[PDB]
Amino acid sequence: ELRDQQEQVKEDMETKCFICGIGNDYFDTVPHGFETHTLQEHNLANYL
Amino acid sequence: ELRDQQEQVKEDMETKCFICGIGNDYFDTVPHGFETHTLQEHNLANYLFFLMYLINKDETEHTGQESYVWKMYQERCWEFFPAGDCFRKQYEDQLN
Amino acid sequence: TMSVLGHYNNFFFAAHLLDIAMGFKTLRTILSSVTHNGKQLVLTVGLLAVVVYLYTVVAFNFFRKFYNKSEDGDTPDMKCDDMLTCYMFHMYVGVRAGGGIGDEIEDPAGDEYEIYRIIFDITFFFFVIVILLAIIQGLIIDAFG
Amino acid sequence: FWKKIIAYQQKLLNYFARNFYNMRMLALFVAFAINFILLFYKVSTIAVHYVLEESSGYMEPTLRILAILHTVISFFCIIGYYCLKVPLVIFKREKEVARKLEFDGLYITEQPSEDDIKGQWDRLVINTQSFPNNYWDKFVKRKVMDKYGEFYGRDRISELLGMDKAALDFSDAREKKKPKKDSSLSAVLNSIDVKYQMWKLGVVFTDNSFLYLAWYMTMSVLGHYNNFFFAAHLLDIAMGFKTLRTILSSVTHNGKQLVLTVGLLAVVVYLYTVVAFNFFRKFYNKSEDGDTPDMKCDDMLTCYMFHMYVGVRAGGGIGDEIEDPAGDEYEIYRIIFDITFFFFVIVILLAIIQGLIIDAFG
Amino acid sequence: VLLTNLSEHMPNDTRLQTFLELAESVLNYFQPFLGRIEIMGSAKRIERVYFEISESSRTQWEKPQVKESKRQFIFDVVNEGGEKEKMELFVNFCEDTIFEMQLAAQISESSILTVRSALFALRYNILTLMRMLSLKSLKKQMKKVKKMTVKDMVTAFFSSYWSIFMTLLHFVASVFRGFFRIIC
Ligand SMILES: Nc1ncnc2c1ncn2[C@@H]1O[C@H](COP(=O)(O)OP(=O)(O)OP(=O)(O)O)[C@@H](O)[C@H]1O
Numbered sequence: 001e002l003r004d005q006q007e008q009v010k011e012d013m014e015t016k017c018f019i020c021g022i023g024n025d026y027f028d029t030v031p032h033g034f035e036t037h038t039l040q041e042h043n044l045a046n047y048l
Numbered sequence: 049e050l051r052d053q054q055e056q057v058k059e060d061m062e063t064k065c066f067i068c069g070i071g072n073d074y075f076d077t078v079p080h081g082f083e084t085h086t087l088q089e090h091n092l093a094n095y096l097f098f099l100m101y102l103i104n105k106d107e108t109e110h111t112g113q114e115s116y117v118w119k120m121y122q123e124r125c126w127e128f129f130p131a132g133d134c135f136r137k138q139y140e141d142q143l144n
Numbered sequence: 145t146m147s148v149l150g151h152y153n154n155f156f157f158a159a160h161l162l163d164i165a166m167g168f169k170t171l172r173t174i175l176s177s178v179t180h181n182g183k184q185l186v187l188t189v190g191l192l193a194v195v196v197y198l199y200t201v202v203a204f205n206f207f208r209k210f211y212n213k214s215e216d217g218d219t220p221d222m223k224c225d226d227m228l229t230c231y232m233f234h235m236y237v238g239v240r241a242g243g244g245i246g247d248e249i250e251d252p253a254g255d256e257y258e259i260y261r262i263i264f265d266i267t268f269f270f271f272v273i274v275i276l277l278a279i280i281q282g283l284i285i286d287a288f289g
Numbered sequence: 290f291w292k293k294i295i296a297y298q299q300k301l302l303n304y305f306a307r308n309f310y311n312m313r314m315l316a317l318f319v320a321f322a323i324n325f326i327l328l329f330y331k332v333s334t335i336a337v338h339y340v341l342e343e344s345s346g347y348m349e350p351t352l353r354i355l356a357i358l359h360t361v362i363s364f365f366c367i368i369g370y371y372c373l374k375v376p377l378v379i380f381k382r383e384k385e386v387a388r389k390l391e392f393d394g395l396y397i398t399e400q401p402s403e404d405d406i407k408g409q410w411d412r413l414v415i416n417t418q419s420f421p422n423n424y425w426d427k428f429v430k431r432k433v434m435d436k437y438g439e440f441y442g443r444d445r446i447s448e449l450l451g452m453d454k455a456a457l458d459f460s461d462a463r464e465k466k467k468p469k470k471d472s473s474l475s476a477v478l479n480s481i482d483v484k485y486q487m488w489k490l491g492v493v494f495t496d497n498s499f500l501y502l503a504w505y506m507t508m509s510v511l512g513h514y515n516n517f518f519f520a521a522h523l524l525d526i527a528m529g530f531k532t533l534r535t536i537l538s539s540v541t542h543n544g545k546q547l548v549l550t551v552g553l554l555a556v557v558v559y560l561y562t563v564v565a566f567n568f569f570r571k572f573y574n575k576s577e578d579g580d581t582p583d584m585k586c587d588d589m590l591t592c593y594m595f596h597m598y599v600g601v602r603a604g605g606g607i608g609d610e611i612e613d614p615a616g617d618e619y620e621i622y623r624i625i626f627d628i629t630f631f632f633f634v635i636v637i638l639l640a641i642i643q644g645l646i647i648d649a650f651g
Numbered sequence: 652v653l654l655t656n657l658s659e660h661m662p663n664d665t666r667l668q669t670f671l672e673l674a675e676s677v678l679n680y681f682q683p684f685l686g687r688i689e690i691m692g693s694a695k696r697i698e699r700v701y702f703e704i705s706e707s708s709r710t711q712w713e714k715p716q717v718k719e720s721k722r723q724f725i726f727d728v729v730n731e732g733g734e735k736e737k738m739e740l741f742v743n744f745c746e747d748t749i750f751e752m753q754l755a756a757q758i759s760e761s762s763i764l765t766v767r768s769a770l771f772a773l774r775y776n777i778l779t780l781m782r783m784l785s786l787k788s789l790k791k792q793m794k795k796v797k798k799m800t801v802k803d804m805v806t807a808f809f810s811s812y813w814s815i816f817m818t819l820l821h822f823v824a825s826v827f828r829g830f831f832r833i834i835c
Pocket residue numbers: 013014016017018019038039042043044045
């Protein structure tokens with residue numbers, strides 16, 4: 001259970017943006033699109 | 049854990065291309081489309097064979113495309129690897 | 145009825161503690177692991193009852209001198225001179241033993257049926273104490289998941 | 290005469306084929322009755338003979354009736370199997386050999402690898418005149434001829450497949466023939482195909498379900514000389530029952546890791562026996578008679594048997610069944626020896642076996 | 652390679668499709684030796700590259716050790732690897748594999764009786780069963796059965812299967828004897 005709980009967090013953070021909730025499929029129409037979105041556009045540290 | 053780790057690799061390799069990262073859903077609009085893409089278009093052994101050919105080929109004998117790939121390889125930039133794009137998606141309206 | 149019978153004998157009020165499974169709703173998650181694969185925990189005991197029977201057959205046909213259970217040399221206490229008694233011995237003492245049937249029977253050293261009886265005991269330990277008592281554990285564990 | 294007798298033959302064959310599965314459940318129910326009567330079976334006193342105890346007196350005749358009924362039903366389950374499930378095996382074999390002849394050229398371009406018993410035995414059925422006897426495709430020979438005929442030969446392929454060379458052309462051309470009689474014994478003996486019924490019998494004798502049913506018959510026949518061979522028929526529950534196959538699949542799923550784990554334990558308890566035989570020999574005395582020791586680690590094989598049997602079956606390891614190490618020069622070393630034996634064998638290697646069964650259910 | 656490029660860039664032309672079938676043998680000989688990858692070219696468009704794969708490269712790529720190395724590399728990338736490091740770890744694996752294959756190429760420079768015994772046992776034990784068929788003297792059995800009884804058809808019908816079972820037992824015994832003779 002504690003392994004599935006930790007795996008679900010990783011899966012959600014790697015397949016969906018924390019803020020907007022849009023999946024990585026939309027963002028990965030441009031190379032490294034999800035990385036760009038989650039580190040420059042919708043970074044959760046930037047909102048803090 | 050070691051079973052889930054081995055199952056995840058199989059699931060990823062059967063549902064997504066290694067190079068471009070496009071899912072099998074797009075490629076399976078033509079029969080055996082994913083097989084054709086992953087064994088003729090984006091085969092990971094073909095990219096290793098191309099690198100071997102480029103390395104064992106004389107530098108003054110490259111074509112322009114080969115020289116472009118060689119320069120990007122020598123300065124370690126991997127933007128010549130298709131990521132999210134391919135031939136049948138670039139020319140989707142022409143090909144289909 | 146079992147509360148009415150609790151007035152003649154006050155020990156029928158202990159049968160009312162079986163009502164915790166029904167009254168409590170949190171004791172039903174623990175008790176569901178047993179009852180989820182509750183039909184495989186009955187066909188596993190039945191399978192053990194057949195396995196320890198094929199061992200009792202071998203013991204009654206070949207290993208009878210090793211089942212004496214006393215030091216009084218005048219009166220033996222042979223527990224495998226009858227098929228039913230030997231089967232009860234194997235089902236009770238050999239099954240409840242922590243190493244198999246070989247912990248509660250005569251030492252086999254210096255005998256013609258020594259390697260055969262070593263194989264007998266080690267296979268009983270592996271197949272009953274280890275494996276068939278692992279299926280019961282795994283059936284409960286695979287129910288929680 | 291030999292239209293009606295074969296009609297009755299087909300009646301019997303159809304009856305047994307229909308009731309194959311019903312007599313397969315009855316041979317299992319008779320076994321639990323014989324083995325339940327066998328629980329009232331004593332030894333009586335030197336001339337030693339086993340006697341069936343009985344207060345009623347009805348057990349002994351009942352056991353002898355049930356011993357013959359079991360033997361009859363086992364033979365009927367072999368007849369029923371031959372009537373019912375052998376044609377499917379023959380059809381499946383005939384389809385595979387035909388499709389390997391056609392689409393792979395298993396006997397034209399390639400050959401069997403001399404270690405494939407099926408591939409070497411399938412050589413006989415190619416030349417038979419009664420080929421696809423069960424398989425639907427009756428044109429497989431004519432297809433292989435059309436495919437591989439030009440390169441490998443109209444005549445080589447015809448010899449290999451055993452098809453007529455030129456009498457067929459002459460028969461399409463001019464010839465005459467005379468009919469024959471069903472009642473003719475010579476007609477029946479000429480009609481029966483020896484070379485095909487040989488290959489069919491060779492395939493049935495290699496079938497893994499016919500061999501088991503023949504073992505079930507042999508061990509039921511042997512159950513009349515000694516009535517305790519009827520206990521070997523209780524191993525048939527795994528096959529007869531389909532719910533005892535989920536429980537028994539946990540063992541057999543990771544059934545190769547449960548054999549390489551016992552082998553690993555056999556090597557681990559060997560490296561402990563080596564250490565014991567080289568360093569801890571004074572601690573393996575197994576009696577209080579001071580005059581005669583019972584040293585069980587003065588020989589390598591005896592010490593290995595001791596470690597594999599008593600130390601392995603012990604609930605705390607080898608240290609529960611050997612001398613106390615206190616007040617000795619090799620005391621901390623022998624404490625480490627025992628605690629590591631307990632951890633690595635009793636705890637860890639007996640946890641891998643548990644986990645392999647548990648990970649099979651999931 | 653020119654024909655393959657023209658075919659894959661002109662996929663609906665019929666004149667080229669009625670001309671490619673004129674070179675099937677040539678296009679089938681070079682199929683193992685023809686490489687095909689896809690790149691993002693200098694024109695910001697996905698381009699397809701055609702190169703040559705030698706036979707030594709394919710033979711060393713299809714070796715069991717290299718396949719296991721590929722499996723381990725794929726497992727590691729999928730589980731313990733990210734997405735920004737994927738095409739770097741892939742090139743790092745390709746280079747090591749290429750060096751290993753090139754070293755292997757230069758360094759590499761220039762039961763049956765057990766099956767036979769079982770086959771012979773089948774042949775012999777089945778011929779023993781077939782010789783009673785190949786007797787032609789069963790006319791005596793025919794004469795005594797000529798007074799038809801359903802009982803005698805039951806008996807003979809059971810007897811044939813009993814003979815088959817006895818033949819199977821003989822075959823098993825012969826196989827066991829042969830195994831004893833061939834283990835030592
Ligand atoms: N809105 C978001 N802001 C930031 N990261 C996001 C967002 N949505 C999704 N992510 C994902 O969450 C990941 C964060 O992973 P993680 O929590 O392990 O931290 P990290 O950035 O890798 O670094 P560290 O572990 O060193 O703090 C990012 O790499 C990104 O893929």
